[PDB]
Design a protein around this ligand. Structure first.
Ligand SMILES: *[C@@H]1O[C@H](CO[C@@H]2O[C@@H](C)[C@@H](O)[C@@H](O)[C@@H]2O)[C@@H](O[C@@H]2O[C@H](CO)[C@@H](O[C@@H]3O[C@H](CO[C@H]4O[C@H](CO)[C@@H](O)[C@H](O)[C@@H]4O)[C@@H](O)[C@H](O)[C@@H]3O)[C@H](O)[C@H]2NC(C)=O)[C@H](O)[C@H]1NC(C)=O
Ligand SMILES: *[C@@H]1O[C@H](CO[C@@H]2O[C@@H](C)[C@@H](O)[C@@H](O)[C@@H]2O)[C@@H](O[C@@H]2O[C@H](CO)[C@@H](O[C@@H]3O[C@H](CO)[C@@H](O)[C@H](O)[C@@H]3O)[C@H](O)[C@H]2NC(C)=O)[C@H](O)[C@H]1NC(C)=O
Ligand SMILES: *[C@@H]1O[C@H](CO)[C@@H](O[C@@H]2O[C@H](CO)[C@@H](O)[C@H](O)[C@H]2NC(C)=O)[C@H](O)[C@H]1NC(C)=O
Ligand SMILES: *[C@@H]1O[C@H](CO[C@@H]2O[C@@H](C)[C@@H](O)[C@@H](O)[C@@H]2O)[C@@H](O)[C@H](O)[C@H]1NC(C)=O
Ligand SMILES: *[C@@H]1O[C@H](CO[C@@H]2O[C@@H](C)[C@@H](O)[C@@H](O)[C@@H]2O)[C@@H](O)[C@H](O)[C@H]1NC(C)=O
Ligand SMILES: *[C@@H]1O[C@H](CO)[C@@H](O)[C@H](O)[C@H]1NC(C)=O
Lengths: 211, 210
């Protein structure tokens, strides 16, 4: 049976073939391939439980498919229409929607970005490349950030197209102000780890019931 | 500390619930099974699941069902549970599912609602009773499928309901699962076909043109 591992078994004896080794923090020494050390604690370990980082590809095959160059100057190519899933007419599926006070969001990336997901979404639902897992600030291992909506605001809301050898099909929220702006104007607050450690903190007390 | 009921619900968490059957929490099948899955991937999909949110059982049924009494039935969201935009219209479109895509579902094959394989239970906005085992061959009412021929579904984000945040994606098929299988559009997957991490990745979507 298939055992889980960093590389597909086919990639040995030299899975890093064609990859310029730069820094041993990263897989094959290449920051585009994400960090060697993966999270061992909740919720990150839950979010990465289904993550085969290269799918069935080897590292250079993965870069050749999803980036402009296997060499270090290659950059990842991103999907059209901001990565929203496309309908049968090749039009993105989304709508402007209001996020309610209390809603918890998370993100792999700096606070200059504009793309978030609902708290706890699996990594493979986000169609993100391996390098979004790289640590840039020691206060935020894996560049993972969690926020809670403190004042209602409108975002582009819709399903995530598959990309980077993953199925996608989470939901993404594309904001019209970066995360820093939303924090400064009182739309989001940062949650620390103790505010998303318990199961009940993932449930929804803010949506009212019918009648 | 995680637990079945919130701490405030003791010493009588099942107050107001008529006990019917000890397979279910408080003996009520509407509140889901006592024994939760211990195997991958159901355990991964339920790791963030607080079954009642911060509510007690009777409060939960009072909010989401017509009656706390056993004749009460769950009330479901408008517009087939799609997230609504700022004009209260559901967000969705018709989309073609590609050959190789894996889907899963809690429910019988007379149903039409599916999600991407491995979506967390709280992303599905499903009540606790969708975890109830109805056929012993399918514990927890859980089914996995793989697209064997392209077909068009309604596709869109899931609105919050049932004290959960939603915001997974749902696929609403125009033919029930039985007819999709009979016509060669879906195939049933054994648990051995979704046991390894690589079986959750995507070999079917082509890369960008360069
Ligand atoms: C507590 O509730 C469970 C579940 O019952 C269902 O849900 C409740 C809420 C009510 O709506 C019921 O009407 C529902 O049926 C009961 O479990 C059932 O118990 C009966 C009696 O022991 C079982 O009947 C047996 O079934 C055998 C075959 O079972 C297998 O195949 C069937 C399909 O053919 C499948 O459904 C089942 O899961 C097995 O895989 C059969 O050989 C035998 O002769 C007899 O008919 C029935 O199978 C049970 N259902 C389930 C889903 O386990 C409990 O009995 C009930 N307890 C009490 C104390 O009331
Ligand atoms: C990654 O980098 C390589 C190497 O190029 C060098 O580094 C770049 C960052 C730039 O600073 C380049 O100026 C620098 O040379 C790129 O390869 C280069 O691509 C160009 C265009 O495809 C090639 O142009 C060629 O011209 C030569 C003659 O000089 C012809 O033989 C070719 O047929 C073609 O016309 C150039 O040869 C090539 N260099 C090498 C060593 O292969 C690469 O394009 C770049 N990748 C990306 C995505 O930018
Ligand atoms: C590999 O990359 C990391 C990250 O860029 C480098 O770590 C930095 O190290 C310096 C000290 O040398 C610190 O001041 C920085 O804060 C670190 N950045 C981090 C942790 O993100 C590391 O030095 C690099 N190693 C090699 C051999 O190039
Ligand atoms: C969503 O709305 C956009 C414009 O909205 C206006 O400007 C933004 C920045 C917010 O301030 C919003 O509250 C304002 O009403 C449109 O450009 C865009 O096309 C809309 N998208 C869809 C899918 O309708
Ligand atoms: C999606 O398309 C619907 C009609 O599609 C046709 O009929 C259904 C029953 C399926 O067999 C489908 O494959 C066919 O192409 C419309 O009724 C519906 O409004 C459409 N939804 C949109 C455009 O959002
Ligand atoms: C449940 O039964 C009680 C008693 O018969 C009744 O008063 C109540 O209206 C019923 N609820 C529903 C939703 O029918």
């Amino acid at each position: 049976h298939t055992e889980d591992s960093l590389f597909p078994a086919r990639c040995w004896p030299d899975p890093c073939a064609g990859i310029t080794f730069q820094n041993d923090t990263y897989v094959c020494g290449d920051p585009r391939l994400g960090p060697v050390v993966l999270p061992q604690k909740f919720p990150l370990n839950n979010e990465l439980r289904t993550y085969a980082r290269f799918g069935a590809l080897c590292p250079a095959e993965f870069l050749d498919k999803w980036a402009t160059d296997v060499a270090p100057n290659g950059t990842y190519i991103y999907p059209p229409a901001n990565g929203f899933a496309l309908d049968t007419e090749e039009q993105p599926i989304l709508g402007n929607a209001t996020l309610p006070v209390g809603m918890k969001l998370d993100r792999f990336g700096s606070e200059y970005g504009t793309f978030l997901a609902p708290l706890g979404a699996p990594y493979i639902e986000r169609s993100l490349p391996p390098s979004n897992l790289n640590t840039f600030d020691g206060m935020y291992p894996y560049n993972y950030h969690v926020y809670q909506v403190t004042k209602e605001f409108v975002v582009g809301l819709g399903p995530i197209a598959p990309w980077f050898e993953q199925p996608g099909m989470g939901t993404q929220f594309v904001t019209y102000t970066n995360v820093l702006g939303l924090i400064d104007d009182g739309y989001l607050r940062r949650l620390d780890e103790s505010e998303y450690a318990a199961k009940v903190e993932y449930s929804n007390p803010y949506t009212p019931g019918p009648n």
